[PDB]
Amino acid sequence: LAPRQVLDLEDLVFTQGSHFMANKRCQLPDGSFRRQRKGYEEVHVPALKPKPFGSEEQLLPVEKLPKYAQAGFEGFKTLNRIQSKLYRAALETDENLLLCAPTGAGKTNVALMCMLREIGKHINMDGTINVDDFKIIYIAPMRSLVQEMVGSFGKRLATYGITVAELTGDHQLCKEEISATQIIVCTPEKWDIITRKGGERTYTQLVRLIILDEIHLLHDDRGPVLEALVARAIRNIEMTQEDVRLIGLSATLPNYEDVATFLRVDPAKGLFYFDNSFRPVPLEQTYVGITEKKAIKRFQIMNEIVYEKIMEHAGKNQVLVFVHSRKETGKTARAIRDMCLEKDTLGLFLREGSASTEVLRTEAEQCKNLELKDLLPYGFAIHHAGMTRVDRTLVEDLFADKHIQVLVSTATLAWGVNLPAHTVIIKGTQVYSPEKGRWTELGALDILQMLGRAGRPQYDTKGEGILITSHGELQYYLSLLNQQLPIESQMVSKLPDMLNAEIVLGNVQNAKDAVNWLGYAYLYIRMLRSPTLYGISHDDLKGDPLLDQRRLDLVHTAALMLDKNNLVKYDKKTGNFQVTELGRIASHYYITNDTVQTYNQLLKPTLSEIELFRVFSLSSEFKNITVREEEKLELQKLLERVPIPVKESIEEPSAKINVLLQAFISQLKLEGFALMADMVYVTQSAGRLMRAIFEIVLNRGWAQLTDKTLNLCKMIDKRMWQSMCPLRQFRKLPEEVVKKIEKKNFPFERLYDLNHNEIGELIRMPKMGKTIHKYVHLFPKLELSVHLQPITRSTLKVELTITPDFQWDEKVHGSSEAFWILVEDVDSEVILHHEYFLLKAKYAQDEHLITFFVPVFEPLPPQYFIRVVSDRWLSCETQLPVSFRHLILPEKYPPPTELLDLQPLPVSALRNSAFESLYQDKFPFFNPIQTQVFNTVYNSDDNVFVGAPTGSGKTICAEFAILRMLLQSSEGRCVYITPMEALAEQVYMDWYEKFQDRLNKKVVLLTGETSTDLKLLGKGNIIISTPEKWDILSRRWKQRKNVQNINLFVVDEVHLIGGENGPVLEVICSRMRYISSQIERPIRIVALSSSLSNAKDVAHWLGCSATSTFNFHPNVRPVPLELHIQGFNISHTQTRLLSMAKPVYHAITKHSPKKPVIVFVPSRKQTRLTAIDILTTCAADIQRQRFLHCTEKDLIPYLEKLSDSTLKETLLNGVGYLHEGLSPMERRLVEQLFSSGAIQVVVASRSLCWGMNVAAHLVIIMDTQYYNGKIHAYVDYPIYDVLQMVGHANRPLQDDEGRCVIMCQGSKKDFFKKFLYEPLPVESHLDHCMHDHFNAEIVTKTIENKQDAVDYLTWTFLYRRMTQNPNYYNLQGISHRHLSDHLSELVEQTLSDLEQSKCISIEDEMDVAPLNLGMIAAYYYINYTTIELFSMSLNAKTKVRGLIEIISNAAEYENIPIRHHEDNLLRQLAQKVPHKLNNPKFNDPHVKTNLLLQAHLSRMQLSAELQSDTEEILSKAIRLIQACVDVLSSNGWLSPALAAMELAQMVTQAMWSKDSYLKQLPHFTSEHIKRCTDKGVESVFDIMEMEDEERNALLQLTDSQIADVARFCNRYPNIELSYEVVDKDSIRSGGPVVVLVQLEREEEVTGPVIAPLFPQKREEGWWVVIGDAKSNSLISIKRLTLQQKAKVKLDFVAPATGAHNYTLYFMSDAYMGCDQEYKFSVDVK
Amino acid sequence: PLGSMTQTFSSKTEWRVRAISAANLHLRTNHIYVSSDDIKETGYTYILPKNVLKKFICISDLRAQIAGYLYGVSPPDNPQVKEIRCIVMVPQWGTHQTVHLPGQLPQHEYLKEMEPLGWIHTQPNESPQLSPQDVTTHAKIMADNPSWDGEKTIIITCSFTPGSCTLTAYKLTPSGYEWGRQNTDKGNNPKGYLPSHYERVQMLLSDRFLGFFMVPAQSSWNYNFMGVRHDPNMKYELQLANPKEFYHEVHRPSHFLNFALL
């Protein structure tokens, strides 16, 4: 490591780029010769002879390719010679390949073979391709080549339904393309910039194959991009273990075996080198090297050579001439055509009267353009990208049919069109480079591509390439084209930028990583094999044979450069690299590191447009630009009139770049040729450069400069200034009428609601007033409105409503439209808040809601401003002032209840020995909080509120109340609510031990199955429940004694009324208060909460006297909490997480070196990543294993029980992790190991922070947002989750303090201080959640008119809060007409929706009554929206078909997640599935659950994800089924109800009605009951009657299983059914006919239903149905549970006289094949 | 000729040099001085909030004066002090000695709770005395607008001292009003002008509350490049938004449209 040394990277650079020539000499093929001539020299190289014909190889017929691949070769018989040598390696192995072959030899088809082998990996059963599984990246060096390969490959692979596409333009709006494209074709730089960001959710981990075409680009200045790509891919193969195949396609040049080493190509398997003998057409070469050094004579020598060479071919051979400008194309074509005229030689070109001479006369007169019309009758033509596409199609077509004789063109034709010519002339090899600020030689790739085009593959016996250059360039071009120009590495200069890219990605975190990374570079390989070329002695290579030291020095040098420019912070001692936001911006925007240092130095928020243009002009990308004397007069004429003044002299290149940009924006024509090429280069760059400046200043909060830079971005992109009429951005408008409009200096926006007529008049062109009107309303326009929601006196919640006020048109807007939302302060100086806003075409007409927080202070500032500004449209903004003149701040909060220095309370104070046994060996005294509330809780019946931080032992306080209840009432009932199911489970086991085990009461945990739960509260003394589970039950309190007879009601974590599921918690508490007031036998209420600022409001609401509300604030936590909030700069979440990785480790060593640590991370993926990262850091601290506090031995009876190999490795080093993907057993083991002190760190995902049974000395919260995949956006952690994670830092019996570090984005630091150091305010959100509860209260007749609904609201917390914080609820006054108006609006709007959904009736606009629908919705706890759709879709002939369809469509399943990676999985599942859907959109949750449901009835085992999703689908399906049963029944439809009742059974046992009833039995092979149908059993009943010794002999199965099938058979229902038609004789029409049914249970209810594949325990339910089977008429139905015996009474009305035969049904809801059917008749009179 | 020389004139428009200097105006906002009376007191104390003062400076020019109207109220129990709450930018153009405002005073619902307190304007040079142009402007506004009380409305000059701005606040006297409403001479020593036409008033800079700006609802406020479109009779509405700097593009569109030609 030390001592390093600092290198001059610039001194190591090969300055000439691809023109570097490492070979000292050049051997020519035999027969070459040189001719001395007129001050120029010619070298001739004869055409080679094709090599024949190998030891054992013949061309391969397509016949003998694998069958799946033949479609891709439709239209060929035999592969060519090269494809035939490669077909095995390409199609039959996954070996990385390097193919070296002359241009046009067939490397393209070899790539196709590799593609086809990858495509083959994903053919599923039906023959389509799983196009979700993979991506293929085809890297082509030139844009024109990319497009040709998208169409060429697109056509070849269409028969496979595969999308080949180029990466089109801007991507922060359009990465749609990429999830849809299987074969991505792009340039090296594009693929670099994409994989530099990653973030995710990328699709680059689907990449399975990368094809590197023209990989000899490595020798180009662009070559380092390929090295960055290859090193990144290969090194990534290591850390992620996903293999990627690499295919290199190369010219035939030296060092190809080093290329192969760099590609991990095995030289014995993957390396193929075909010399120039394999060129399709042999090539005769001429090189003409001019010696004349004088510009003008050299110039006409050039044209002399060209003409003399052209004449050797006039009339004989088509000539393709190459020059390097759009402009010299015509000038050369004319120069040639003209001196033929002068010497009367055009007659040799054309046939005095050919078929062709008129074919071009005809097409020339119709060809439409100047340069071409002139030349085309003479056999001449031009071709370049500055002309048409169908003129170019004209030129290519005419040339193709041998019609044009001489075609002058540029390199683009060579790359983008397949257009060979017998003779090729390269007129000069010098090109102007704006990048280098001077003329240089053409790149190797260009020269190769052009001369490759000589010799047409079918027509020609040979091709003739003629290259005219300067005589000193002869050896170079001779070497390039005769296999001898070695491929070198150009990357030492690019080293700093590409190292930063790896640092930004997290791939390289220190100098050792970078030495490793550098080992993957082509540079490294060349250094090892030619040290001397790369500046290394042979003595030095050899004291350093892996170039370990050298790489450290290089990395050292580059890191120092990055650190000096502030992209990276580099610690030389440790070699550690720290990422920065500047660094990330430089990498992600493809900016060189010297430029972002200039930007950091010069950017200031006070910057003017003048200085901004200057900053841009100083970008190092322009460092080679100079001011030429021949440019200075045209530059000064423009400098005189620039709209943005330029401080610096025109002699400074800064001024010239500045002027070029402004001239570009004003769309000026310039006459200098260099100047326009410079303009093009300055402005192509401006795009990403200025977008970098913008991101820098936006994230710094610099309002004014953010506006300026975003506008300059758009001015550059749109080529106009602000001052121009924005309608010019509609390119389909005559730039005429816009200039018309600009002439009239009138403001743009009073064109808006003015009409079609007055437009035409104001402009004085009524000729088109409707068209201007049209475009005026296409122009994007948003209306803004705001609801201000004070949280405190210093935090404001803002709900912004965005209303699109413009007409959409995909022709103009595309699929989406982006905006920036910018909340700015009083002075439009500071951006207080900003976010990106994407208006999608599917939502172009909806209102969009945005919520965010801003700080506020006192005295209140006058206003803020919200601006919504287009990301791309110029002059496209709406600013909404947000004045605070009427903002009503909530009162500052009261002081907390003092914590009194009381004598700590012994457990003896309980004065009860049994009670003391619950505690006395856990501790000797209760904490200060339990000591202060003890008397009130234990010696009083007052309602009591206790507010204190999580970790203060609040739940013990409620235990105090349960204990008092047991003294007063030996069979008193306690209901305890907690908001989270995981908390209910924790409390259940601790209270089960305390009150049932050690006190012999009954502790019960409500399941969410209704009569299961009802039995529990009838027996239990402690009933534990989550809110919804108590809501469903407590709704029925008037009919349910065991609800109003509650002695004690305890609600825990009641501050969660203010969170997302608060309204149900508010409602059930409000109900317990209302119930207790009615029955006049008070129900005691105890409320436990985190510290609340508005505690008194909760307490008043729950009827807690002032002395019985203990509102403590956070400073009183028994174990002191040391809280540290660290802010992080980086705005991009992946990079920010990276910036937090090391600080996580340092926080552990600083705050808890020996004591246990929980790290909370945002995601399942991240838990693993961070455990390993913590470990890697521990190993480079050389403190490996210092978190392992047990032996490497005691660990492994624990360890082998695990399935995850990584969790085992990390556990072995003292670090566990927890996430919901691990087996419940894996989590318990990790927890035991953590609580036993064996391992010191556990990394838990955020979603686990409520179900964690472990505590720590230090909690680190690594970031505070998570990615929500439904909304494709990052979401802040709810404050409640944060308070809950912080509470895990609390070990009362082990620590003197708890410590927590919160790492968050810096913009969130102030918020966390405000809401963690201080107690929390909570609001109601019940007013957004009213319908389902109003409906329940109308069903229960608590609400019977609109006035009742108003009174009902007065019981709620929502309502206390309306006077304390009126603005939060959109009230402007707290007056009593104010809230009585506001209450009535909420009432009228809620009842109107319910009445319109036909859940309730409203009569006299006053009286409300429940309807059957509403009763169903209330009874089953089903959204009234769901029950409404249930009422539209179910009909009289609904079957198992539609029942599942209708049920999936419930609102309860709207939030079932769509995972992009399951799309084809769900597609293939819809084919594995019995019922086929109707045109399924696989993006819909209701379609998804429809298939999960069919998967379940079919017992298809799916991934852990889809089975957790199935388990939540299943938790709701019974009630929706039963609701359907109820709807269909009330509508009289017989068959669909009976179907719905079997659906209940089907779901419970996971089968279909067609299935065998034996499929219900435990351990039953579905192989062997077609073995059971084979020998006389079809039902369960047959199995039980069956001799014993033969019973064990049927099944071919074990004996513990035989007891399992026995227990099932013994709970399987066996019921005796009686029935009698009472008074069957005296039955008259229109009279009462009563049928009496008797159900006697053989057995017991010996336990609940047995259904191992159903997630909840169920009780047997039953229907008794009287139907008219012939008529499809249900006449009577009754629901019942059954014990031993039960009697049922079914009434109906007699029809007309008969002769009337009915059918009696007894149907199960849980088991299949238990149904009974008895026909009976009634003779009516 | 002297056909041994041959020189081409090259344009050097003066606004470009002024636009470069206007981009460094922010530096002056860190060094802002209020002259202390020594005249001494006259009735009311005016407290000017720094935030709008700094912005007012940043949007100005160093040669062409700009002006804004002052609005504010008295602290609740404190009739003696006038807190300036809003500065209104209206369509205007200026020279180095005066500003040209419309005849119409600002009208907006937001100002009707406040009272008019006069105006503020930038000045190229610090002067010991209130301009006679200033006295004339203030008196002709008073004559046409009874809402401007001679005892309650002030002129705040903000003078471009080197590296700084120096503020000083004056009020008209009765004799000043009567002289200035009849005065038709534009120059610097018009007949009848004399220093007893104004008193100095106490003015304080403060950070304890923020002011806000109102600007025209359709245009901007700067017409110094579109003078022909400006007229004493012009009517304007207002909006709650912050003013654009002097050489913002919206103020000089012809610089951008005539450069693009061709």
- Asked whether A888 and A865 are in contact (CB, 8 A), the reply is no
Question: Residue A742: its chain B contacts at CB < 8 A?
Answer: 257
Per the listing, tokens 């709770």 go with: B113
The CATH code belonging to domain B1-262 is 3.40.140.10
Write b or e for each residue in A1189-1206: b if 16 or more Cβ atoms lie within 10 A of its Cβ, otherwise e. Answer: eeeeeebeebbeebeeee
Angle between helices A1062-1079 and A1357-1364 (to 10 degrees): 110
Task: Please tell me the number of Cα atoms within 13 Å of A1026 on its side-chain side.
Answer: 15
A303-324 burial by CB neighbour count: b if 16+ within 10 A, else e? eebbbebbeebbeebbbbbbbb
Find the farthest-apart pair of alpha carbons in chain A and give their distance in angstroms, rounded.
Answer: 134
Q: Which two tokens stand for residue A25?
A: 């000499």
Alpha carbon distance A1549, A1559 (integer Å): 9
Interchain proximity A722–B256, CB inside 8 Å: yes
For residue A1262, the cross-strand partners are A1303
User: Would you say A948 is a known binding-site residue?
Assistant: yes
Instruction: Residue A65: name the closest of A55, A56, A77 by CA.
Output: A77
- Encoded amino acid at B188, one letter: N
CA distance B74 to B71: 11
Q: Would you say A267 and A22 are in contact if contact means Cβ atoms under 8 Å apart?
A: no
CB of B217 within 8 Å of any CB in chain A? Answer: no
Residues 6+ apart with CB under 8 A from A1602: A1591, A1592, A1595
How far apart, in Å, are the Cα atoms of A919 and each of A906, A914, A925? 10, 10, 9
Encoded tokens for B15: 């606004």
Supply φ then ψ for residue A1538, to 5 degrees: -55, -40
Q: Cα dist. A303→A296, A298, A673, B161 in Å? A: 11, 9, 21, 69
- How far is the CA of A446 from the CAs of A218, A432, A449, A560, A1055, in angstroms? 14, 14, 5, 36, 70
d(CA B146, CA A1338): 64
Work out the burial of residue A1708: count CB atoms within 10 Å of its CB; fewer than 13 is exposed, 13-18 middle, 19 or more buried: buried
CB B198 within 8 A of CB B128: no
Measuring CA to CA, how many Å separate A782 from each of A804, A868, A882? 5, 8, 16
Please, which residues have CB within 8 angstroms of residue B35's CB and are 6 or more apart in sequence? B166, B167, B168, B200
Nearest CA of chain A to the CA of B200: how many Å?
29
Contact A759, A769 (CB under 8 A): yes
Helix (H) or strand (E) holding A1548: helix A1534-1549
DSSP, res A613: H
CA–CA separation, A1709 vs A1540, rounded Å? 9
Residues in chain B: 262
Quote the CA–CA distance of B115 and B119 in Å, as a whole number. 12
Contacts of A661 (CB under 8 A, 6+ apart): A613, A616, A617, A682, A683, A686, A716
Supply the DSSP string of B29-64, one letter for each residue: GGSEEE---SS---SPEEEEEHHHHHHHHHT--SSS
Residue A1003 contacts by C-beta under 8 Å, 6 or more apart in sequence? A988, A991, A992, A994, A995, A996, A1020, A1021, A1022, A1024
* Burial tier of A31 (Cβ tally within 10 Å: 0-12, 13-18, 19+): exposed
How far is the C-alpha of A733 from the C-alpha of A728, rounded, in Å? 7
**Torsions phi, psi for A247 (to 5 deg):** -125, 120
Q: Is A106 labeled as ligand-binding? A: yes
Kindly state the tokens that stand for A703.
């309002």
Report d(CA A13, CA A417) in Å as an integer: 35
Look at the block and give the residue holding tokens 């080493």. Answer: A261
Asked if B240 is an interface residue toward chain A (Cβ–Cβ < 8 A), one would say yes
What whole-number distance in Å separates Cα of residue B115 and Cα of residue B120?
15
- List the structure tokens of A561: 């450069």
d(CA A1551, CA A1653): 10
CA distance A737 to chain B (A): 15
Beta-strand relationship, A1003-1005 and A1022-1025: parallel
- Strand pairing category for A463-470 and A283-290: parallel
At B85, is the secondary structure helix, strand, or coil? strand
Sequence-ordered list of residues with C-beta below 8 angstroms from that of A1434, at least 6 positions apart, any chain: A1442, A1443, A1446, A1524, A1527, A1528, A1531, A1533, A1536
Full DSSP string of B175-223: HHHHHHHH----SSS-TT--GGGEEEE-EEEESSS--EEEEESSS-SB-
Q: Which of B16, B211, B256 sits opposite A721 (nearest CB)?
A: B256
Beta bridge partners of A33: A44
Q: B51 to chain A: which residues are within 8 Å by CB?
A: 826-827
- d(CA A802, CA A836) in angstroms, rounded, equals 13
**CA A1614/CA A1620 separation, integer angstroms:** 20
Resolution to 1 decimal place, in Å: 2.4
Instruction: Say whether A643 and B262 touch across the interface (CB within 8 A).
Output: no
In the DSSP assignment, the letter for residue A1267 is E
- Angle CA(A317)–CA(A319)–CA(A322) in degrees, nearest 5? 165
Q: Would the CB atoms of B209 and A640 count as touching at under 8 Å? A: no
Using the Cβ of A878 and the Cβ atoms of chain B, whether some distance falls under 8 Å is answered with no
Q: How many residues does chain A have?
A: 1725
Contact present, B19 and A644 (Cβ < 8 Å): no
Annotate A1333-1353 with DSSP letters as a single string.
HHHHHHHTTS--BHHHHHHHH
Phi-psi region of A198 (alpha: psi -120 to 50; beta: other; left: phi over 0): left
Q: Which residue of A has its CA nearest to B55?
A: A827
Q: What is the DSSP string of A930-977?
A: HHHHHHHHHS--S-EEEE--TTS-HHHHHHHHHHHHHHH-TT--EEEE
CB contact under 8 A, B250 and A722: yes
Query: How far does the CA of residue B196 sit from the closest CA of chain A (Å)?
Result: 38
Which pair of structure tokens corresponds to residue A1074? Answer: 């209302």
Instruction: Give the whole-angstrom CA distance, residue A175 versus residue A959.
Output: 56
- The Cα–Cα gap between A1636 and A1469 comes to 47
Find out whether A215 and A246 touch, Cβ atoms under 8 Å: no
- The Cα A1368–Cα A797 span in angstroms is 8
Place of tokens 């029925």: A1036
Degrees to nearest 5, angle at CA A1019 with A1015 and A1022: 110
Residue A1439 in tokens: 């079957």
Helices marked H in A241-345 — which ranges?
256-262, 295-311, 326-342
Question: In this structure, are residues A574 and A1177 in contact, taking their beta carbons and an 8 Å threshold?
Answer: no
Residue with tokens 């939060």: A1368
Instruction: Collapse the DSSP code of B254 into the 3-class scheme (helix H, G, I; strand E, B; otherwise coil) and give the result.
Output: helix
- CA-to-CA distance for A1343 and A1334, rounded, in angstroms? 8
Residue with structure tokens 């007033």?
A769
Q: Which amino acid is at A492?
A: V
Chain centre to alpha carbon of residue A236: 21
Structure tokens at A505: 């990605």
Contact predicate B72/B45, CB 8 Å: no
Q: Is A103 annotated among the ligand-binding residues?
A: yes
> What's the CA gap between B57 and A982, in Å, rounded?
61
A863 at B interface, C-beta within 8 A: yes
The bridge status of strand A135-139 relative to strand A183-186 is parallel
Residue B235 forms contact with A (CB below 8 Å) = no
Instruction: Determine the angle formed by the axes of helices A1440-1448 and A1534-1549, rounding to 10 degrees.
Output: 70
User: What is the three-class DSSP state of A1058?
Assistant: helix
Instruction: List all residues 6 or more positions away from A868 whose beta carbon is below 8 Å from its beta carbon.
Output: A782, A784, A802, A819, A820, A821, A822, A837, A877, A878, A880
Kind plus residue range of the DSSP H or E element containing A491: helix A491-505
* CA atoms of A1007 and A1013, how far apart (whole Å): 6
CA distance A1713 to A1707: 9
Token look-up 């000797």 returns A924
CA dihedral A845, A849, A855, A857 (to 10 degrees): 80
Amino acid at A1483: N
The helix (H) or strand (E) run that includes residue A797 is strand A795-804
Experimental method: X-ray
- Domain ranges within chain B, ordered by starting residue: 1-262
CA A1245/CA A398 separation, integer angstroms:
67
Residue A1508: count other Cβ atoms within 10 Å of its Cβ.
13
A1363 three-class SS: helix
- CA angle, corner A488, sides to A483 and A494, nearest 5? 150
Instruction: Classify residue A283 as exposed, middle or buried by CB count within 10 Å of its CB (0-12, 13-18, 19+).
Output: buried
For A45, how many CA atoms within 13 A lie in the half-sphere containing its CB? Answer: 24
Neighbours of A765 (CB within 10 A): 17
CA-CA distance, A1373 to A1362, in Å (whole number)?
Answer: 9
Q: What whole-number distance in Å separates Cα of residue A933 and Cα of residue A957?
A: 7
Q: Which of A1520, A1519, A1524 is nearest to A1432 (CA)?
A: A1524
CB neighbourhood size of B192 (10 A) = 11
Residue A575 exposed, middle or buried by CB count within 10 Å (0-12, 13-18, 19+): buried
Which of B242, B248, B254, B258 would best serve as a mutation to test chain A binding (most A beta carbons within 10 A)? B242
SS3 A1134: helix
For residues A559 and A464, is the Cβ–Cβ distance under 8 A? no
> What is d(CA A1671, CA A1407) in angstroms, rounded to the nearest whole number?
38
CB A1693 within 8 A of CB A1724: no
Distances (CA, A) of A1377 to A113, A1369, A1371, A1381, A1384: 80, 15, 11, 6, 10
* SS3 per-residue string spanning A196-250: HHCCCCCCHHHEEEEEECCHHHHHCCCHHHHHHHHHHHHHHHHHHCCCCEEEEEE
Tell me the torsion sign for CA atoms A409, A415, A420, A425.
Answer: positive
What part of B 27-66 touches A (C-beta under 8 Å)?
51, 55
| Beta carbon pairs, A and B, within 8 Å | 85
b or e along A59-82 (b: 16 or more beta carbons within 10 Å of the residue's beta carbon)? ebebeebeebbeebbeeeeebbbb
Question: What is the rounded CA–CA span in Å between residue A643 and residue B248?
Answer: 11
Cβ atoms of A115 and A163 closer than 8 Å: no
